[PDB]
Subunit: 225 residues, 5 copies
């Protein structure tokens, strides 16, 4: 029969397989659309902030440039951690310590943001990996039930069992149609999350470089009046 009349004419287990695979497709495309608009906005904002800080030339100038980036700015956050470390460290003779403590801080928040970016990629990787074998389960179960049928009666003449076989194969087709776009989407999102991490670490590095240079130049100006 049709693909439709072929679905509900199948075994309850095979029905389950087909419906589950279709829902998997829905989750794939939902994740795709939302995360796509998200990454485009964040990448634009970060690129803008980064090129504005490119001119910074000191850490206080960078703070002045970043003042209006918004409270949700990742650059503003990294700059604020460096400022927080300096202020907590007021009175210390050891600039190496400040530098150490600041690098540890920035590198850790960058890492954390990357871990936010990937939330949901676990579902994509899992769907693309497991969908073909789930479809495969469906068709194996369907054809298994078919052959359990042919030796009961017990028949010959393949044309009689053909519909159950076709209905079973539809399960594998749906399994593949679910997996392939999941795999593709997973690949692009991995590439973009990597690129985003790289950009964010670029800003964090700008911050550390400014802080390091500032500490050294100030210590030198203080040692020789």
């Amino acid at each position: 029969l049709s693909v439709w009349g072929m679905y509900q004419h199948a075994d309850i287990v095979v029905k389950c397989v087909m419906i589950g695979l279709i829902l998997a497709s829905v989750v794939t495309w939902a994740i795709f659309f939302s995360k796509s608009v998200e990454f485009f906005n964040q990448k634009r904002r970060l690129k803008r902030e980064q090129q504005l800080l490119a001119e910074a030339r000191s850490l206080n100038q960078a703070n002045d440039i970043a003042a209006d980036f918004g409270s949700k700015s990742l650059s503003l956050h990294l700059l604020n951690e460096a400022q927080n470390e300096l202020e907590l460290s007021e009175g210390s003779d050891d600039n190496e310590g400040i530098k150490e403590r600041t690098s540890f801080r920035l590198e850790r928040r960058v890492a954390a943001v990357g871990r936010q970016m990937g939330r949901g990629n676990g579902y994509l990787a899992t769907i693309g990996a497991i969908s073909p074998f789930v479809g495969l389960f469906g068709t194996v179960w369907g054809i298994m039930n078919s052959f359990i049928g042919i030796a009961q009666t017990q028949t010959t003449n393949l044309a009689v069992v053909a519909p159950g076989i076709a209905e079973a194969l539809l399960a594998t087709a749906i399994g593949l149609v679910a997996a392939i776009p999941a795999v593709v989407i997973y690949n692009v999102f991995a590439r973009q999350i990597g690129g985003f991490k790289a950009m964010l670490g670029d800003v964090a590095a700008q911050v550390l470089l400014l802080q390091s240079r500032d500490l050294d130049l100030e210590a030198s100006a203080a040692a020789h009046p």
Copy 2:
């Protein structure tokens, strides 16, 4: 008709089905016990991390964590650092203290990570060998099918059907055992990674407090 499929079938395939069945049960037991364990451990650690965010020195962190409980992971990290300070008493070299402390604490995070994945070994091997076992069953079934053609001498469809049915059942059960073990192993591996990361953040907070405090004490003496 699964109970009817169960022994309608060959002794070898009875073995395949029962063994794989057990594989599934151990898989899901592991899933439920360790999964609830991870929910609880994560919830407790996240709470302790919030309370300790309010600490502006190490002594205050120790005061905040005092009543965290006997098995608290944050309390263990703080105490490891306190132990290094106590053992290093009288030393002029704060770089040495900092170094020794990080080494100890990071070495601790790793170990906690190692014991979270303790059950994962079983999952990894089950998902590893379940298709093999399954495949054996199905290879057995098709083999029997040819014995039918040989003993019956009639090559119609009704003769080959039992072996094909058996074989397919073995493949189906092989998939049911293999797939969840594999994805559960991956989910647990991810959860362990995030937990190691959170715990590493608490250790980081401890190290930063100790480093800043040492520097400030040394400057107040100069």
Copy 3:
């Protein structure tokens, strides 16, 4: 019953034995093949030229016994020269640090900068290889979809028209298999080209890291020799 009235057809008459879905799988796979080969031909000449240029720069700078001599060597390398960019970054760090007492800081900052740049370049080399790895990964399974859908249609044919024989849905079965065959032919060159690019990119990264390391070593040694000559005249 005896003899026949029928026959089969050629490649164009096989195409007539697939449904609309399988026709799409085949044509889409073949276009996929075209993008793999365009990627290959475009990136190949690019990589070759940059690799020759960099190889020359690296051999010439390997002779530099000092950071000043290295600057003289690279003087006219061109505006787009990667080596010249690394040297200019080291010079920039020295210049931004003018007035500082701490040479460790300069060394630290310079290494942090240069290593960063090398990594970025690697990323700018990897552009498009994701298309290759993805094409080589999923093309055999796109082909498999074609095959599964085809045999499904064949079993529908067996079911509506009774009895059996074959001869009817047999061409459709052959066409379905053909879809997997085309899938494999799409996957293989993608996988091989991809491996070649992974190797060549690895070597290019090593060459850049060699230039970068030579720059850092010259800067480190020169800072220390200057510091020692300033302490003890």
Copy 4:
């Protein structure tokens, strides 16, 4: 019958023999190594200085791992006598202990490769056997001319036996391989723990000594 099918089957059973040899011998090795290290680490728990750790380990047996790590640290101190730079000693000692620990891990892993591959490829040489046999059968039905698969069916069943055996060979290879891999993991952690204790003792004693010498 045929020829190569039976050689696939025998080569698989040979592979099984190798699997079992590795299993028994490695079982002994890992269990004795783990027991020795566990005790050594418990006894070293008490030492309040590097010297106290050497003295405790001094009768561990000549092949003890803990005693070797301690002797590396002691050797580095002895070689560096006369030196005013304790950061150097520390550095050198860590480098040594890191290398030595790594090398020991290398040795403990040896032979696990054979398990990994036997478990990986054993079902495919099995498959090769059946494919070869059934290929022979189907050149057989091409010869003469037959129908009624019943003539060639027993040969085809014999051919499948080769895959069956391939899977049987692979299964224990794979399990033993996993068990031994978790073992190598635990052991590397234990060895790193003793190494770490050595480094901490030496570092702390170097610092308390340098301070007391200044004042």
Copy 5:
């Protein structure tokens, strides 16, 4: 297997000849790189044993003098001496140490990379040989199904040849794929071990240099 491959299809003839060339390449790579790794690891193991006796960099240089021109150890020692000569006149021994370790660990990496050469081809052959064999079989059964119609009968004898050629493609695909991947893994493991040993020799060189710098500095400070 003689008349057989003579009567086959041109495409399947291509998959077969390609697969067997893959096989010959794997075994050529295997024999040459096998003896090469054997000789190099013998040489290095002897050198590491002999250098374990050095109590300083000069003593190591005397031990290594006749190691030969192709010796990796001599290369490492000469590199470390070169760093000492270029830094002559510098008061900063931290710098010297830093520069030296950086150089040696990169030389080690480079040797590893140079041995990783050609293992790529094994990795690629082991990667695509199942795809080619599998293509062969897919083509074979495709052609057998084309065979049944026309003549438009089922039976067996015209269905059997396509089955025979497909199975042949699988078999030769296995014979090409399996040894290529196994050899690739064995060589990757050997390369890892050699790189670790070489790093061990390098570390010996670094430690001797470090200790000598510190002892010279101490003998100058407290004469």
